[PDB]
Every structure is written in structure tokens, then in C-alpha cells.
Amino acid sequence: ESWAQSRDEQNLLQQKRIWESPLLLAAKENNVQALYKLLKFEGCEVHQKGAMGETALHIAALYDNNEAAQVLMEAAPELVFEPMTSELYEGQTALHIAVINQNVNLVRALLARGASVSARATGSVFHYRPHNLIYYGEHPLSFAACVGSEEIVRLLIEHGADIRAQDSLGNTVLHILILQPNKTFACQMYNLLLSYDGGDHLKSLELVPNNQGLTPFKLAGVEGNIVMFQHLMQKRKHIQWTYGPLTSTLYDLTEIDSSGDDQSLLELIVTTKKREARQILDQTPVKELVSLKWKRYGRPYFCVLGAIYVLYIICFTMCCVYRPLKPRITNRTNPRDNTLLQQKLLQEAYVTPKDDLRLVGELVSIVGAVIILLVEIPDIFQTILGGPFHVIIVTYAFMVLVTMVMRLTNSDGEVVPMSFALVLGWCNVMYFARGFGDLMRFCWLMAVVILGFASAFYIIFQTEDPDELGHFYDYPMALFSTFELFLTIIDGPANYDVDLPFMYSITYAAFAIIATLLMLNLLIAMMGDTHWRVAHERDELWRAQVVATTVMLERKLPRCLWPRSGICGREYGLGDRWFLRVEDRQD
Ligand SMILES: C[C@@H]1NC(=O)N[C@@H]1CCCCCC(=O)O
Ligand SMILES: [Ca+2]
């Protein structure tokens, strides 16, 4: 018995109780001659409750029967105060119902009887849930603003309706208006509510935050309401001058930027699972902001950090390709004849004819792996948009450390964690391709993959006998052999009289999948560019990835680098805030 079945049972049950009781039916049927005949002579108790704990007036308010409802208030004035006692509709009054249906004459009569406008409808159907078709809040004033009845809104205000009222979720009337379908109607209704504010610079209602720490303006950007977002921007932009077509306007740039841990409107847009919020980044106050942060200080640092990480990876592979080597000391090669093994694990690495040159490189691969963990592990909680680069980088350092833990214990399978570090470390270089967009990305994407897998394949078959399956006997041969395996020109390295290492079968399955996807993705990329304006859907995704990466770099970089966006106002003399100067042309 699901919860949706119960309300279906109750709604069917409610009609039964209305059908059974002749008083509830006459209120539903608007039978005035009955109500006097029902009530004045042997009247069933007027405080009668239905299946939902509704009063006879509550039923008279649902079906806009003003005349039947008027009989119920004159014969019994106490019914106006009574709220619905059922669990589903707990707190709702006859005033809430009359406001929804915009029955103005009944609303006017209900305030004449002093119906409390502070009545909170805390019922279950009024909860902000996906199984509820409408969310209007808990106050009758909030109901008036949502139905768009400006007449009821000011009328409710006249009788002392508090516009600062917050529901169970801490949402004000303004927060609720942004969560509405008809955005262009709510824009008119939104300005109506603001005029009734006290006008104090303090305690402004637009500053009252959601319980999740969201002002109405900030919530509009998170929710993706462009109409409200463009609307709420008029208050916070200032036009400096008008020079013919040119117009230099100054934007506030206060709740849109960063000195808040999660108060950044950018961080909220890039971390939310709302795909609709991706379009707020293209709005004219924001699109210039993110573009300036990327042009300078976003692009160079990404490339500066890019060359460092690239150099860090090749250095690590340089230690892997020329790692310790030992002959097959055991005569075990004859038993289990399938083995082509010349295993090469030794502990005489301290001797340094050229080994220290690897030791200092191995030390770099460790101090860089912990530095990698020193900047991503304290950065706990998680949304990937620019790529799963953060998921792969920590697993890489995990492998290097595990490979380091594998060392000194002299475990034979040192290749296993070391091979995972090669693919994971190199494939993260292809994430740097964001900084010729068509084809050339795959061109650099494909080059990284072989260097990540050819170098891996070389490590696995560095031990085995190159006479059988000698596809990667040389590192320049591992590169070329894996390069042509990328295009299926060469049949996959296979020999069945011997037993191959299990890392090859694992690495090849992972290589075969990627090689096909990139070749599959390349072909569509060629069509999708000349297919339709879907290229813009493919374009704005990358532009969002660039913005997501730009916000990523600004978190950990210190304050000495990457100065604050815009220009401060404290002398010139207009703000503790930072303003962005934008000028546009009109035609
Ligand atoms: C029609 C029912 N009868 C009644 O007296 N109140 C109910 C009103 C139904 C509104 C449900 C709003 C929602 O979906 O949350
Ligand atoms: Ca073949």
C-alpha cells in the first residue's frame, strides 16, 4: 500500500463521507434551501468533520459556492478559525482554499470575520516534493502571489499579512515565486511584493536567505530561472553613461563571486545536478566574468601546471622503463614450459653506476604523489564536469604509493600497481586538452593514449621472451606497435603455446575499448560539426567544462596569484564590493 494509494483511497473516501452526510453534500451541491432546512430544524452538528477533517465550510470553499458558504458563516461563525485536522491537509483553513480559487468575495468576507492570515498549512500535500504537483508554501499570502492574483496579494497585506513569513524550509514568499512555471507573470508579482518592504537598508527581504543559505537572487541562478535572473539583475546594475549606441554599465558582482565557502554562485552552478543552471553562465553579467578569469590567469596557470604535470609523468615513466633488471635465477623455466619468464626483481639497487639517476627520479615520483594527495584528499566533498581528472589523479598516487609499498617488501608482482599508474597518469594528460577544437583534440587525445598504453605494454613484456610475441621488445617498438594496434591494422598480440601475463589481457581489454570509442567519437565529431546547431550543445558543454576548471584553479591557488575579478570600490568610493565594468553596443 503505497502512500499514493492512500490519498487515492482518501480522496475516494472523502467523496463517500460527503455523499453520506447530507450537510456536506449540500455544501458541495450549493443547496441553500437544504442548508436552512438541514440546520435550523434538527440540524446535524455544524462542527461536523469529514474524511479529511474538513468543515462544512471547507467543502463550501473548495467548490466555489459563495451562497452556501455564506449560510455556514452566518449560522456558525466559529468555523472560519477551524483548520483541517487530517494529516494530509493539516493546518489548511477555509481562507487558504478561497485564495487558491481566487474567490475574491469569499476572501473579502473571510477577512471581515478576522480569519488569521498567519495560518500555516503544514499538511503533507503542501510539502515541496516531486509527487506534489504544486508547491505554494504554507501561508495564504504566499498562495495569492503564486496564483497571480495581485488583488488578493495587496488585500491580504492590508489585513497585516507578513511578507517576511518563512515556511518549514525557510523559504520566503520571494523564494517560492522563483519556483514557478509562469516566470514572466511572477516577475510582475515579484515587484509588487517588494514595494511593501519597509524601505530600510537593513533587513531587506531580498537579503533574507533560504535555510540552505540561499538568497532569492542566488536561488534563481541555481534553479536556472533566466527570466527572474535577468529581472533581478536590473536592481544590481548601474549605467555609467550613454555614448550613442555604446552603453557602459556597472554590475554589482557581489553574490556572483567568491569570498564565500559555498556562497559562490559559480560554485553552486558547476556543482549542481541541474542541467538547466548551465545557461545562467551565459547571462551577460556572468559570461564576461568567467571569460576574463580564463583569458588571463586561468589559461596560463592551466598550461603552466599542464607542462609541470606532463613533465612529472614522463619522469615517472622514465623510471619505470629502465627499472631494476635481474636474470631468471631459477631453473623453473623448464617446468611449466609455457612460461616465457625472465623475471627481474632484485634488491641490489643501492649500487649506482647509473641507478641514482633513477633514484632521484623515483624520489620525485613519491614526493609528487604525496603532494597530489596533499591537495586532493583534504578536498573531500563531488561532481565531475570538466572530467574525472580528480578521481584518476588520486588513484594514480595510490598506485605509486602501493608500488612503493610493494618495494622493500620485494613482492614479485611489482608490475601490477606500477602498470595502473602509467595508464592512469598518462590518461589524465588528455584532460589537459581543453586549452582546432575539431579533430586536433582527438589527435592529441590519441597520442596520449598510446604513450599511456605502449609504455604500459612495454613494462609487461619487458620480462617475457621477445622471440614469441615480440611486439614490444623495444620502447620505440612498443610505441609503434601500440600505435598501429590503435587502428586495428595489426592483429592483437596473441600467442597461445605460451602463457601470457594476466596484465596484458587486462590492459588490452581496457585499451581495445578506448581505442574504439575515440575512433567512434572522432567519426561522429566529423559529422556533428556539419550536422546541426547541436555543435552549440557540444560547444556549451566544453565552455561549461572550461568554467568548471577555472573555478577549480581559484580554490587552491593562493591570494598572491590570481587577483580578484573586477575593481574594488573603496575609494573611488562606491563599495566594500567589487564591480565589473561592461560596455555593450546596440544595433
Ligand atoms: C481537493 C481536496 N479537498 C479538500 O478539501 N482539500 C483538498 C485540496 C487538494 C489540493 C492538493 C494540493 C497538492 O497537490 O498538494
Ligand atoms: Ca589480421
Curated annotation (Swiss-Prot):
Residues 1-300 are cytoplasmic. GO terms for cellular component: apical plasma membrane; calcium channel complex; plasma membrane. The modification Phosphotyrosine is found at residues 135-136. Glycans are attached at residue 331. Keywords: ANK repeat, Calcium, Calcium channel, Calcium transport, Calmodulin-binding, Cell membrane, Glycoprotein, Ion channel, Ion transport, Membrane, Metal-binding, Phosphoprotein, Repeat, Transmembrane, Transmembrane helix, Transport. One of its GO terms (molecular function) is calmodulin binding. Ca(2+) binds at residue 491. One of its GO terms (biological process) is response to calcium ion. Expressed in duodenum, proximal jejunum, cecum, and colon. Residues 475-494 dip into the membrane without crossing it. It is found in: Cell membrane. Glycosylated. Phosphorylation at Tyr-135 and Tyr-136 by SRC leads to an increased calcium influx through the channel. Probably dephosphorylated at these sites by PTPN1. The keyword tRNA-binding does not apply. Homotetramer. Probably also forms heterotetramers with TRPV5. Interacts with TRPV5. Interacts with S100A10 and probably with the ANAX2-S100A10 heterotetramer. The interaction with S100A10 is required for the trafficking to the plasma membrane. Interacts with calmodulin. Interacts with BSPRY. Interacts with TCAF1 and TCAF2. This is Transient receptor potential cation channel subfamily V member 6. It comes from Rattus norvegicus. The lineage of its organism: Eukaryota, Metazoa, Chordata, Craniata, Vertebrata. The gene is Trpv6. The chain holds residues 67 to 677 of 767 of the full protein.
